[PDB]
Amino acid sequence: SCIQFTRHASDVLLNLNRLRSRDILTDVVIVVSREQFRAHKTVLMACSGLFYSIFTDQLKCNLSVINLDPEINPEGFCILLDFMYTSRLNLREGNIMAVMATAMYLQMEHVVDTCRKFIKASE
Amino acid sequence: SCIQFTRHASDVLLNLNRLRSRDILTDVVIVVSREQFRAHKTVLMACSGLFYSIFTDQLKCNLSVINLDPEINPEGFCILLDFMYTSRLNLREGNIMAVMATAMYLQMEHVVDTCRKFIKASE
Amino acid sequence: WVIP
Amino acid sequence: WVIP
Ligand SMILES: CSc1ncc(Cl)c(Nc2ccc3c(c2)CC(=O)N3)n1
Ligand SMILES: CSc1ncc(Cl)c(Nc2ccc3c(c2)CC(=O)N3)n1
């Protein structure tokens, strides 16, 4: 018999992004080919199968620095980190291959799906 | 020129609630008249003006235990903590006064608004 | 607010 | 996915 506030999840995500922009309570640095990205472990886990696996590991859960595979493109990661905190994906002709490869590595199934669809339309 | 995934914010919140239910990466205990509630500081801040103020304080941000005012009802807090992680509010005739008072103290404006409206309809 |  |  609950009532539901339609905008609650969006408002929560908007506030989490405000915390990220002001570097409030960020608890991890993600290193991508020497570029560094500060974030909240819980948000990374909520968006990515890879971060979910990493931060549920009894040893890795306590790390303050995570280094991604050197093949990962920093711009592709940046675009995906922005998507995690906003639901908005900056998908462009020039970045779609790097975004799809990064989303496959991060295990972000819905992003992989839209990249596959956008690539298929151009062929 | 971004595209947007409609269900992303809801899916993020659902995963954050899964983490709460399994007590994964919870970093604070909220004490309410001896009842204890584990949660994520970032989620509490994203939902409540009071927790936002508390965890942005340079001393309180580092506390692992927060004690609420003794007038706060544990059931009213529990219902609001559930709402924070799900967008669902269990508002009932028997709890509406405790839920509204707790939402006013926690500074959860949209919850206060629906409680005022539901009370006004019964008068 | 809605009935979910 | 939509055009926001
Ligand atoms: C599976 S239970 C669960 N519980 C809590 C969390 Cl934080 C979580 N995250 C997560 C797991 C897998 C995937 C994603 C998030 C996005 C995606 O495409 N795959 N999962
Ligand atoms: C105001 S900027 C901002 N930035 C980040 C966060 Cl985490 C935050 N939370 C917050 C503040 C006030 C209120 C709520 C959340 C719910 C409500 O009714 N009032 N606010």
Ligand SMILES: [Cl-]
């Ligand atoms: Cl470390």
Ligand SMILES: [Cl-]
């Ligand atoms: Cl995704």
Ligand SMILES: [Cl-]
């Ligand atoms: Cl403490």
Ligand SMILES: [Cl-]
């Ligand atoms: Cl609210």
